[PDB]
């Protein structure tokens, strides 16, 4: 696994999107040790509320506790290993296994065991048979993440320099809500194909989505045919130590939405931008109403503006269960919230007319990584290479001066390679000591 990504994350072996054994290895490194998106406060707002989430290939029950905290547990009975919960979301103070009737609390404790008195007696210690708990649960402004590795950095540290870019929308806008339920569909591509596309693929928009731009008249029509850069400027792209990165297209608050969404959305964003400029400054207030496309390492992606939140849930090396949520700013009028929720699915949900374009990009890349000769071809992530900066006065992290660029691909794959070559967090840190230099 040592040389699947080259120095500076410049090239990647195509095999990474198709190799079966590497997928197994990712479960052990990538998904076993990194922060993985679970849910938002707004989807489990009341005590007893739960959702069923994936963490890599495993499934967890994510539950709002009676004291207001959140705990998550592997969705597996401690008796014979039956799956415990089959609903995708609900409210319950306990979960009963349908096999023999063991009853657990929403806190994971084994509370009731049929025939305990008559047949078990002291042959059972319920304290030792609680659901297997996810040891790390942290949030970023309502967005809840889990981690199987107790040694992981705090979520905020893990977000690194990416957090600064997220804050105008996620922190300073007055709170977001995640609108459920998500769209779900299975796509025959590797999880990394989606992750790299969302982390920094401004380059594909004008070409892959040429027809959708013409039809819907998205603000992205400016880059149609990859003929001209946006009149607003090339934008930015950034990356960070732990692999998260994103592009910024200035001012494009309506993102991949069609013309019918533009006037009302732009009016709402311009109005809050003026308020925000006074609190956080002109540049950051502009970021608030700009289009950010990014990936929170490894497999959680987002768009701001055309507000989407994605999880690329791995099934196997060429199969991914794609989740699509919309998010809204809490103080949007309720009609606008509903319109945004439908517009997200309309572009990038299971029946989205943009995302349908992407299938063949993702799927054939992944399927080519399985083929003997083709798998030895390198992918190149050279756009903007040699022009990235670190320690810029205005923009933190490793930063390129174009959202049409591969700065964030390079950082994503750098972090990826460091993890697959490492046995633990200490080794990752050693492998990342000079990540920006």
């Amino acid at each position: 696994y040592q040389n699947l990504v080259s120095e500076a994350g410049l090239t990647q072996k195509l095999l990474i999107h198709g190799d079966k054994e590497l997928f197994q290895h990712e479960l052990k490194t990538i998904f076993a040790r990194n922060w993985l998106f679970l849910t938002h406060d707004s989807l489990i707002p009341s005590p007893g509320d739960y959702v069923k989430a994936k963490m890599g290939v495993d499934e967890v029950i994510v539950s709002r506790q009676n004291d207001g905290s959140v705990r998550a547990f592997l969705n597996v009975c401690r008796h014979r290993g039956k799956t415990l919960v089959h609903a995708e979301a609900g409210n319950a103070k306990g979960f009963v296994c349908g096999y023999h009737g063991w009853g657990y609390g929403s806190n994971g404790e084994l509370q009731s065991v049929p025939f305990e008195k008559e047949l078990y007696g002291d042959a059972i210690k319920k304290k030792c048979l609680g659901l297997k708990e996810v040891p790390r649960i942290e949030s970023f402004h309502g967005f809840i993440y889990g981690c199987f590795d107790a040694e992981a950095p705090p979520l905020i540290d893990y977000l690194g320099d990416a957090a600064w870019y997220l804050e105008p929308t996620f922190k300073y806008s007055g709170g977001l809500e995640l609108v459920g339920p998500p769209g779900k569909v299975v796509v025959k591509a590797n999880w990394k194909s989606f992750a790299e596309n969302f982390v920094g693929d401004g380059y594909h928009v004008g070409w892959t989505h040429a027809a959708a731009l013409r039809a819907g008249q998205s603000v992205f029509s400016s880059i149609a045919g990859n003929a001209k850069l946006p009149p607003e400027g090339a934008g930015l792209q950034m990356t960070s130590k732990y692999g998260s990165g994103m592009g910024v297209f200035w001012g494009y608050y309506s993102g991949n939405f069609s013309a019918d969404m533009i006037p009302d959305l732009m009016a709402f964003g311009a109005a809050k931008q003026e308020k925000l400029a006074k609190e956080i400054g002109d540049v950051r207030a502009r970021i608030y109403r700009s289009f950010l496309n990014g990936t929170i390492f490894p497999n959680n992606s987002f768009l701001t503006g055309s507000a989407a939140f994605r999880v690329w849930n791995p099934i196997d090396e060429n199969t991914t269960e794609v989740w699509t949520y919309a998010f809204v700013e809490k103080d949007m009028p309720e009609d606008l919230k509903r319109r945004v929720a439908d517009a997200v699915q309309r572009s990038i949900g299971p029946a989205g007319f943009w995302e349908s374009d992407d299938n063949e990009n993702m799927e054939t890349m992944s399927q080519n990584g399985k083929k003997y000769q083709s798998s030895n071809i390198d992918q190149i992530a050279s756009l903007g290479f040699g022009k990235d900066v670190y320690g810029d006065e205005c923009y933190p992290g490793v930063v390129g001066k174009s959202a049409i660029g591969e700065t964030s691909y390079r950082g994503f794959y750098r972090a990826y390679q460091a993890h697959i070559s490492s046995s633990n967090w200490a080794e990752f840190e050693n492998a990342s000591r000079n990540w920006h230099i």
């Binding site: 995708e88 319950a92 339920p181 569909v185 040429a210 699915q345 299971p350 995302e355 349908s356 799927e363």
Partner: protein, 194 residues
């Protein structure tokens, strides 16, 4: 015919009423007429005549909606958050956009030309009891989509429609609703007109 929802524990009040509607609404002439209508509509879609479909078969006031329902416990009362995501929820302009995207020569996914085959069955129709120009229509659809040598996707759906008679003799779709039966379709996408 009436369903007793107290004894028939699996039946929703919505489905029970609707069954009754279509039972008492049976009319032989209407059945033949609507069967012809849906066969024509499906043929038009199969040959990818999306503009002709949108102009001649779809009314300006169209609501074209396909939902995916989150799986909830049959006994879990308290959790009241929205249980449906709109895979489609389109007005006329939004369908126009999707149709344009379909016929653009730079729609890369449409090259080579995709093959569609639609199977429409179990047609049931009833005139609305208030608005007699409105026809309630239920029909089941199998849609086979083939492309790129070995890609095959099969979709299965019940379309719950309202159609409207037009001055001159035409009949146009004013609402289509589909509660898509597979929560996570294994079909790459659902970019098909059900």
């Amino acid at each position: 015919m009436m369903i007793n929802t107290q004894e028939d524990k699996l039946v929703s009040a919505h489905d029970a009423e609707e069954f009754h509607r279509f039972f008492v609404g049976h009319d032989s002439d209407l059945q033949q007429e609507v069967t012809t209508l849906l066969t024509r509509e499906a043929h038009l879609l199969d040959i990818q005549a999306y503009k002709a479909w949108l102009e001649h078969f779809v009314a300006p006031e169209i609501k074209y909606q396909v939902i995916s329902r989150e799986l909830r416990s049959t006994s879990e009362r308290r959790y009241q958050l929205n249980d449906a995501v709109n895979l489609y929820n389109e007005n006329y302009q939004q369908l126009k956009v999707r149709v344009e995207h379909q016929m653009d020569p730079q729609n890369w996914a449409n090259n080579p030309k995709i093959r569609f085959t639609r199977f429409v069955t179990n047609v049931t129709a009833a005139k609305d009891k208030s608005a007699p120009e409105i026809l309630h229509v239920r029909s089941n659809l199998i849609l086979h989509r083939a492309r790129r040598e070995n890609q095959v996707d099969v979709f299965y759906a019940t379309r719950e429609d309202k159609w409207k008679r037009i001055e001159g003799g035409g009949i146009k779709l004013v609402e289509r609703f589909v509660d898509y039966p597979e929560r996570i379709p294994q079909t790459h996408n659902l970019l098909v007109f059900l």
